[PDB]
From Swiss-Prot, chains A, B:
Part of the full-length chain shown: 67 to 677 of 767
Description of post-translational modifications: Glycosylated. Phosphorylation at Tyr-135 and Tyr-136 by SRC leads to an increased calcium influx through the channel. Probably dephosphorylated at these sites by PTPN1.
Cytoplasmic face residues: 1-300
Protein name: Transient receptor potential cation channel subfamily V member 6
Membrane side Extracellular: residue ranges: 322-358, 409-414, 466-478, 499-509
Intramembrane segments: 479-498
One cellular component (GO) term of this entry: plasma membrane
Renumbered ranges of ANK repeats: 18-48, 52-81, 90-119, 136-165, 169-210, 212-241
């Protein structure tokens, strides 16, 4: 406690040793006469290491002091090779400091001496950490590329600077240029480094991946660099023809799509916590890509799978609305007069008349729950909500159905507690399917969301009071009136089921508490959709997020669906003779 | 699945055959030496049809390759006449491709050869479909007019380009210019094509109608082209005099008004789904036209017809508030104790004392319903809500009155279900009559809408519980308290009629559900009118729509009203000697 306090002390301790060491002070003050009155008479320790393990030349390189540095190099040419022996700057040479300060005469003189163009500055200051204001890499060639000094860049290549060099994070000089603030100027420097590549199709510098398996083009999309992305897109697009205003350009569509497997631009954009990366799926090679995946295949399968989940949940309630008998049997109704339980457990089953109709319905609710677990549980092993918490709810729903199964086969009294949780988890997970005029567009999402919530809480409130006596607190004595009570409940017109002389079950005081919060948030999410659609162009901000939600869902539907359905995007390039990648044909009009 | 996938494959398949065919490749690459080393030794198939049924000249015309095209024309002058034999480009000649690319030297050379200036490019790419980025027509003259190349336009007329030419959609060159994005530049090209007209008053190019019966001037209004509309308005306005800043201009007002019959700019603007066309009724010849139609004749007749409909509905409730007797008679009141019915049916009528007063009232409710059907049902045969859903409700209201008549004459128990629907349909259709300070202006619409809704639901809730016992659930035991209960109901102050030990009729659980939604939307439409009037100039957006609603209603009132009322707009031009059209006198001041 802490680390920044140390370097703040060391930077003060550095200026303290510079103040003290006259050789280091004269190197800072550029006192030429004081350096000759020190190096020639009387011979002072010229290999003097300062507070940061720096030589007198390092100090002479920090402060642009060419006259003082040239004196230190002619009286002791060995100081050029000495790196910073400190921990904060372990590996930095006098060439690194001269390159960043863009001191061309000092760089030309250090290269004339013979300075190492491959020295890795592995100091803790040079790390890619949020507490370091700059991240340029380790090699001096990487420093020149980031300061925008094209003169030093080629001057280092002339002395044998390996552009293929990677730092401790496996980043080439191309990766580091994309992580820079000046995006519009780094595009110019990016093309300068590519010219010095081997010129061969194999072992390309643009193909050398990051240590996290990211080519520079791929890293531009994950980091949300629009300027570098559009620039890198030029190298991978081909214009077929120009018919007046139309321009039928053909995009490469290789590193932008599965598979893979985890390697694909789309999966990396929807799963990253970087908001800025959202904008990448709106670029002119990518926005055409997800819009076609959602028009065909995407939207129909989401509604086909949607209607299946609607039937699978209405069947679960069909077995809940007609749950198992019987009357109380027990005389316990006389003691503890606050109780209202006409408790109903089994079995006492089969017995079959109309009970096999619900047994096959209960069997569907079980085989569907494990199928839900058979497609989700093997997926958590390989987690970002963008995207909706549909997956978090779909696994806890099948968890409650299995618990209700284990609740059964034991004749437990608390049947109702796990079974009522699956009612809201089953329906409210339906409203996620609303992904399938903006005031009217967001209003229809409320009408969907609202009708979905009441069909999950009225079914719940029915079960909560299907056992309990309806003469007192009879808001839900049958299904058509449990729906109507809950509907009125949703708008606070009814005072809500309230009774204090009677002991209502533990689940009402819990389920109604959650119904009171969701009913207000949906009524609060409605006002923001009524005003936030008209008050400003924020409706665009209220819009892409949904669009990104649709894109996140479209990538989701492509992972588990087999290959016979959902054909690959684009057109393959084997016979016709483009190999072997799949290309997207895009034509655009200009005005 | 799909069609765009095919052309994406064919464009890739085209570049595949170009890659393969050396004659087609050299035509694309503009390889002059390779074309002579192919056409002279050894004689290759020069009539080579590519993937899109294109000749080597077509490829030489796609990519501006004049040197390569001139070689193909001197070695085989027959390639000029060959059109694209494919399905996507059926009819396109090498002249079409040269005109769009604005290759004047190639167009001058193709016309020197003798190219057809009347070749219709009937290919599927050239269709007016949303999946085609451009729509220029079929004839090469129409292509030049859309690219803005006035040099090619007159160069085609010099070689006999028929400006009277129509494509498959019956569109002249004037119609296609209005459907173009560059509106401010198409005005210049529009005047160039009109100069080459026959110069005769009859058979004018501006009068040649679309296949959908639309002159170019009329099409500009339907499509919402403001720049072309104001430009076309210059040709049909006459300035009478200039008295300083005043300019008394006289507008033609011919194709802007009925009749007709369906042919009129106003009816085409209010019935189209094109939002952009709304702006046309705000132009300086049209905005003066509907404002005079609404000031006189318009506003009074809407309130005269308004007060008539107010009396016709209050009479319907006057017969409902005093509906037919009698007591229950039946002992069924002891079994099914949940029931509260003191059911009342007839007849048991006449009997007449004060019952003839309601019989003539019931007779008015019948003759008025058929009259409503006599003015609406013959109108559906000849449907856009702009405009209000007043017509959809006014026909279903008279439907419920006729059903209640058929409900009667059979002594059916369910009298109440069709009769209660006509109460809300009758009143809530009144609030449409609110069409007759912006915060205060939209607030008075709420006070109208609110008082109209409660007078339709309190009358309904009264009927719902006029039969049922008032000792339990007695919110509506008489009319003055049914109104006061419902009024309090409208603001959720009262917990709403709630009872669970008693079986309330089927209509309360339905009518009160609709009362709970409309009462919140009117309270939500109020907040948007309180904030959306001040937060931005969106109040203009909240305003024209109402203005367009008033204009849509004004056109509605002019269709069924006879000719003796509502005189024609403007002044006729027969004696005085302007013939025979009706003109509007408009004077404007400038600063
Ligand atoms: C100024 C210090 N004195 C010195 O000789 N090297 C240091 C250079 C500081 C660079 C800090 C870059 C970073 O924040 O990581
Ligand atoms: C490029 C294609 N090659 C060719 O010879 N004709 C085509 C011209 C394309 C025009 C497409 C206009 C449209 O979208 O309809
Ligand atoms: Ca309240
Ligand atoms: Ca209350």
């Amino acid at each position: 406690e802490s680390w920044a306090q140390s370097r703040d002390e060391q930077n003060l301790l550095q200026q303290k040793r510079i103040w003290e060491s006259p050789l280091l002070l004269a190197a800072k003050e550029n006192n030429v006469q004081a350096l000759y009155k020190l190096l020639k008479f009387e011979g002072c320790e010229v290999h003097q290491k300062g507070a940061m393990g720096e030589t007198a030349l390092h100090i002479a390189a920090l402060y642009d002091n060419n006259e003082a540095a040239q004196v230190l190099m002619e009286a002791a040419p060995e100081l050029v090779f000495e790196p910073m022996t400190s921990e904060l700057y372990e590996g930095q040479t006098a060439l690194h400091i001269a390159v960043i300060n863009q001191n061309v005469n000092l760089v030309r003189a250090l290269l004339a001496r013979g300075a190492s163009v491959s020295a890795r500055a592995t100091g803790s200051v040079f790390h890619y950490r949020p507490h370091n204001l700059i991240y340029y890499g380790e090699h001096p060639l990487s420093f020149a590329a980031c300061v925008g000094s094209e003169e030093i860049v080629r001057l280092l290549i002339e002395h044998g600077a390996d552009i293929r060099a990677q730092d401790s994070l496996g980043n080439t000089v191309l990766h580091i240029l994309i992580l820079q603030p000046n995006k519009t100027f780094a595009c110019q420097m990016y093309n300068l480094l590519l010219s010095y590549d081997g010129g061969d199709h194999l072992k390309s510098l643009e193909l050398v991946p990051n240590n996290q398996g990211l080519t520079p083009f791929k890293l531009a999309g994950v980091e949300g660099n629009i300027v570098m992305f559009q620039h890198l897109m030029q190298k991978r697009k081909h214009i077929q023809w120009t018919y007046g205003p139309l321009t039928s350009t053909l995009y490469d569509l290789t590193e932008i799509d599965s598979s893979g497997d985890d390697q694909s631009l789309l999966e990396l954009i929807v799963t990253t916590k970087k908001r800025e990366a959202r904008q990448i799926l709106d670029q002119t090679p990518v926005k055409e890509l997800v819009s076609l995946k959602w028009k065909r295949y995407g939207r129909p399968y989401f509604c086909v799978l949607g209607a299946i989940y609607v039937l699978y949940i209405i069947c679960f309630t069909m077995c809940c609305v007609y749950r198992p008998l019987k009357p109380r049997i027990t005389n316990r109704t006389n003691p503890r007069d606050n109780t209202l339980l006409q408790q109903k457990l089994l079995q006492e089953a089969y017995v079959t008349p109309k009970d096999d109709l619900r047994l096959v319905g209960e069997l569907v609710s079980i085989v569907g729950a494990v199928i839900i677990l058979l497609v989700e549980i093997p997926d958590i092993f390989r987690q970002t909500i963008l995207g909706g918490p549909f997956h978090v709810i779909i696994v806890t729903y099948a968890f409650m159905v299995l618990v209700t199964m284990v609740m059964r086969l034991t004749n437990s009294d608390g049947e109702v507690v796990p079974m009522s949780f699956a009612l809201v988890l089953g329906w409210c997970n339906v409203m996620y399917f609303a992904r399938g005029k903006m005031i009217f567009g967001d209003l229809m999402r409320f009408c969907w969301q609202m009708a979905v919530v009441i069909l999950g809480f009225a079914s719940a409130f029915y079960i909560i009071f299907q056992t309990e006596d309806p003469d007192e607190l009879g808001h839900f004595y049958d299904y058509p009136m449990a729906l109507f009570s809950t509907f009125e409940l949703f708008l606070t017109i009814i005072d809500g089921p309230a009774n204090y002389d009677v002991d209502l079950p533990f689940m009402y005081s819990i389920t109604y508490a959650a119904f009171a919060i969701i009913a207000t948030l949906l009524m609060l999410n409605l006002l923001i959709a009524m005003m936030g659609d008209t008050h400003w162009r924020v409706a665009h901000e209220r819009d892409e997020l949904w669009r990104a939600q649709v894109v996140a869902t479209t990538v989701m539907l492509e992972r588990k669906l087999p290959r016979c359905l959902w054909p690959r995007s684009g057109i393959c390039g084997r016979e016709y003779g483009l190999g072997d990648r799949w290309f997207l044909r895009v034509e655009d009009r200009q005005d």
